Paper text:
Tmm7211 is a bacterial FMO which is able to catalyze the conversion of [name] to DMSO. Tmm is a bacterial flavin-containing monooxygenase (FMO), which belongs to the class B flavoprotein monooxygenases. FAD and NADPH molecules are essential for the catalysis of Tmm7211. The catalytic cycle of Tmm7211 consists of a reductive half-reaction and an oxidative half-reaction, similar to other bacterial FMOs.
Next, we tried the soaking method and solved two crystal structures of Tmm7211 soaked with [name] for different soaking time. For briefness, the crystal structures of Tmm7211 soaked with [name] for 5 min and for 20 min were termed as Tmm7211-5-min and Tmm7211-20-min, respectively. The overall structures of Tmm7211 soaked with [name] are similar to that of Tmm7211, with the RMSD between Tmm7211 and Tmm7211-5-min of 0.1 Å, and the RMSD between Tmm7211 and Tmm7211-20-min of 0.2 Å. Despite the two structures of Tmm7211 soaked with [name] were solved, the explicit electron density of [name] in the structures could not be identified. For substrates with no ring structure, such as [name] and TMA, there may be no effective interactions to stabilize their conformations, which may be the reason why we could not find the [name] molecule in the structures of Tmm7211 soaked with [name]. By comparing the structures of Tmm7211, Tmm7211-5-min and Tmm7211-20-min, we noticed that with the extension of soaking time, the electron densities of the nicotinamide ring and the ribose ring of NADP+ become increasingly weaker, indicating that the nicotinamide ring and the ribose ring become flexible during soaking. Combined with previous studies that the indole and methimazole molecules located in the binding site of NADP+, this result suggests that [name] may also be bound in the position of the nicotinamide ring of NADP+, and that the entry of [name] may repel NADP+, leading to a conformational change of the nicotinamide ring and the ribose ring. Because the electron densities of the ribose ring in Tmm7211-5-min and Tmm7211-20-min are rather poor, we could not ascertain whether the ribose ring can form a hydrogen bond with Asp314 of Tmm7211, the equivalent residue to Asp317 of RnTmm.
Residue numbers in the entry:
A (entry chain B): 1 to 442
B (entry chain A): 1 to 444
């Protein structure tokens, strides 16, 4: 009988819409659900958008993906337990597909029934307060430039945390005669063909943006790290150096003495958990980490058990972890799962946070998020999927990356849902310029 | 005894802080004033910021000015009546200085006294409602990431309207392999040296951005217009054509049949009046125009006479019009100027709006904004300044631009405050590659 708001129709919002759909299909009555989405269409980060900065309505652009982007982990690690790759595609396909292929898969799962009709597009949630046992939500109908309001019993926040960039300043940027941008702004690597590119950062964005520039003909790529290098086997014309000190004209100078001609600086410096549309008392405040506190089972706002956050953890797992979170959230909303006492909640959060703080390397992190996801899996009815196989896959993938960062996407993994073995793509990633769905689907 | 909030410490917010400072210096008691500014420092659009999009706190970047920017109208048309160029600089200087020079002038006026201490920097107003005769305002202390609240008797909105870009979509952008950006994003024109550039738009940004790209070495510049061309005398490597039809891979295709290989598309397509931090009932909704309705004397919100907007009109005049608006607003706050009846207010708004809709060319627009500003001038005590001279200067300047768009910045105008004649600069603008104040003010 309740009313539920969902903010965002990317993978997470769709996961929970899908979780509710399972119940509705079985004949169970479900709450009225309204999902708000500021983009024109569903899909979240998996939508390519040429736009950067803010849109025609003055709304910041949430899209961060670029042209000719390929998935960066094995698809077998992100398969939906309730909607297999074999089911969607009708055949085995390689393990590292281009963006549009995974976009098609994500949207395919939810596009058969009534889910899309529940979403309000070009609609931006702007204000949320909890009063008289209800979430009072203001939202902007962007197309009409009008503020609307509604009230809800439960609120699910699924707005991601890789859209609002963190952008640090370095000395000399005020006079640098070239482009300075964040990875959030990166759209087509052809922009930088023939250019000397500087990339700052040491995680997924720095890695892939650097490789993307090199693949699309950058004259040179120089990666600066603050703490430790990624240490991958970079191809000729790429190097990793310690700590940008300053830009001095067309020259980047690093603390280790390196001086490099620079045409463009791409800050691959991460993102903010940013929730301007939530009251302070409701607002998760955290850096990117595997287990932020104040979230029971990584989902329920400790302070308000009718506020549920999805996908706010840093990510090895993605799609099927979001699913496990969403099935859990659904069952909480439906009162199938009961909240334990405040003391038990606090104890459980501390247990996981304590483990998280002690993680020292990717193997331990993969193990950590495996156990986190498996525990969620066991408390609801999300279907069978082999998280132990996924655990092994992630570790194998990490090894591939150290062995050869240029060829890890040329590897085959097996489905943890169907056992199907992925073929090796007809074209090595380094030479794969045709990222079309047709070619991928041979 | 009242408490006054001002949003923004750009030229307009500084104008009203300065207007109040005049009274305080004379010995008059003035209200408590709090000015909120999202930037790290004062100056508004006159601050150069390498940042684009949004900042390290997730706050959209309000800066739109680029490297190599020079005054686009005669400085004599924007002189402060109460702080002359002669006073600030101690000598006559050319009429079209680079950004840093005019920034220095703006901040010079307000930097001698207690104004800076009234401003909270890296502070963003986020919510405003009017309740029980007060504006309840929430603002974000960005450095601490904390929401604070306060209440005020009057609210002055001076957040400009050239910060939040209007960015239209054209067919084929989703598959374009080059850069697509708005003029709001434009920073260093050297970025486009040796590139083919497309500029869309027909106003000041399109004009100046196209010129900067050419000046700093673009392989070509092609300007697309929707309605009519600017029609200026463009130099070699530049052309003006009708209406972008689509991007087809790298190729820009126009409705007049032109096809141009493109490396970058720069949308010089204007900006939004954007006030997400104001309640719907308080929010001005308008496109860029010389006289938006619902603003008595172009300043007082028709529906709430304690809400005052500055600088929201499209601009020939800038600084001294902002001043005349601010002096007016100050006097309204101080109860020196009384509001007329509702009917009188409505009639006066209709009178100006009706005149505004009938304007057909820049001469008429210049005359209109001259009369608007002169009427403001006459109802308060902003010092003597010759708006009739400014009227003539603007018309002369429009002529210079048609004559030769490359050399209008080389011309000389006289001060409407002191009469001083500007010397011709030591470097013609078309050759002036260095935009530093140091280089400008010093011997060649
Ligand atoms: C460049 C990049 C590449 C990546 N590549 C991979 C990959 O190869 N494999 C992988 O598994 N993962 C990848 N990811 C990770 C990504 O986080 C997940 O794949 C997934 O997109 C997370 O989904 P989400 O729903 O939680 O958030 P999102 O996909 O970001 O969805 C959030 C949605 O909320 C909307 N929203 C935000 N604020 C509001 C508001 N106020 N009102 C209404 N709507 C709002 C946004 O428009 C967006 O649609 C990548 C991430 C990035 C940034
Ligand atoms: C590219 C460009 C070139 C120009 N060149 C010229 C020129 O050569 N000559 C000329 O006369 N005019 C020029 N202008 C015109 C310009 O509008 C005026 O000179 C002047 O800057 C307007 O000042 P303002 O105070 O109204 O607004 P702004 O200068 O924009 O100041 C507004 C301030 O409000 C702040 N702000 C906004 N929102 C918030 C919030 N929510 N909370 C707190 N603070 C906020 C912003 O940070 C900014 O500091 C130019 C404009 C542009 C865009
Ligand atoms: N499909 C793909 O190929 C692809 C491509 C892009 C990104 N992604 C996704 O993007 C998401 C986020 O990855 P991310 O790399 O953007 O964020 P991230 O994992 O949070 O990493 C942020 C990086 O910024 C660095 N950093 C922080 N402050 C800095 C500073 N002041 N100067 C320089 N560096 C600074 C950090 O290292 P230090 O603190 O040591 O400096 C860190 O390496 C991931 O989910 C990933 O999957 C995937
Ligand atoms: N100091 C300097 O040299 C300098 C440099 C740049 C800017 N500025 C200042 O910046 C301020 C704003 O000027 P502006 O030119 O940015 O804004 P503007 O005056 O509002 O002009 C907006 C332009 O966008 C065009 N347009 C609108 N929709 C469009 C679409 N869908 N496609 C293509 N074009 C579209 C309009 O023409 P159509 O409607 O006919 O298409 C118009 O020419 C001015 O105050 C100016 O002084 C100064």
């Amino acid at each position: 009988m309740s009313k539920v708001a969902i903010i965002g129709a990317g993978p997470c919002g769709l996961s929970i819409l899908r979780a509710f759909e399972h119940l509705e299909k079985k004949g169970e009555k479900i709450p009225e659900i309204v999902c708000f989405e500021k983009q024109e269409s569903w899909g979240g980060l998996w939508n390519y958008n040429w736009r950067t900065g803010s849109d025609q309505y003055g709304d910041p652009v949430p899209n961060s993906m670029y042209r000719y982007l390929w998935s960066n982990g094995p698809k077998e690690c992100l398969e939906f337990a309730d909607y297999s790759f074999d089911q969607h595609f009708g055949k085995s396909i390689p393990s590292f597909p281009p963006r549009e292929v995974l976009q098609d898969y994500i949207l395919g799962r939810v596009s058969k029934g009534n889910i899309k009709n529940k979403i309000k597009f070009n609609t931006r949630v702007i204000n949320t307060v909890y009063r008289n046992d209800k979430f009072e939500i203001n939202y902007q109908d962007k197309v009409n430039d009008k503020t609307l309001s509604d009230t809800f019993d439960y609120l699910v926040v699924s707005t991601g945390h890789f859209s609002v960039p963190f952008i640090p300043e370095y000395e000399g940027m005020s006079s640098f005669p070239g482009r300075i941008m964040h990875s959030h702004d990166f759209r087509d690597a052809e922009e930088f063909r023939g250019k000397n590119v500087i990339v700052l950062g040491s995680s997924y964005s720095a890695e892939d943006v650097a490789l993307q520039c090199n693949k699309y003909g950058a004259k040179s790529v120089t990666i600066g790290y603050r703490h430790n290098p990624m240490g991958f086997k970079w191809p000729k014309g790429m190097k990793e150096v310690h700590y940008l000190d300053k830009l001095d004209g067309k020259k980047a100078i690093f603390k280790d003495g390196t001086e490099q001609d620079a045409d463009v600086v791409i800050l691959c410096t991460g993102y903010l958990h940013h929730f301007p549309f939530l009251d302070e008392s409701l607002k998760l405040k955290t850096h990117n980490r595997l287990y932020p506190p104040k979230l029971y089972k990584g989902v329920v706002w400790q302070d308000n058990h009718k506020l549920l956050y999805l996908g706010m953890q840093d990510q090895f797992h993605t799609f099927n972890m979001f699913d496990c979170q969403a099935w859990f959230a659904r069952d909480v909303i439906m009162d199938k799962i009961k909240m334990p006492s405040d003391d038990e909640i606090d104890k459980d959060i501390n247990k996981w946070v304590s483990m998280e703080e002690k993680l020292e390397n990717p193997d331990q992190m993969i193990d950590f998020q495996t156990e986190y996801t498996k525990e969620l899996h066991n408390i609801s009815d999300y279907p069978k999927i082999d998280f132990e196989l996924i655990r092994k896959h992630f570790k194998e993938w990490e090894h591939h990356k150290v062995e050869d960062i240029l060829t890890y996407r040329n590897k085959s993994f097996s489905s943890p849902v169907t056992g199907s073995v992925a073929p090796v793509h007809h074209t090595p990633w380094e030479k794969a310029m045709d990222d079309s769905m047709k070619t991928f689907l041979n």
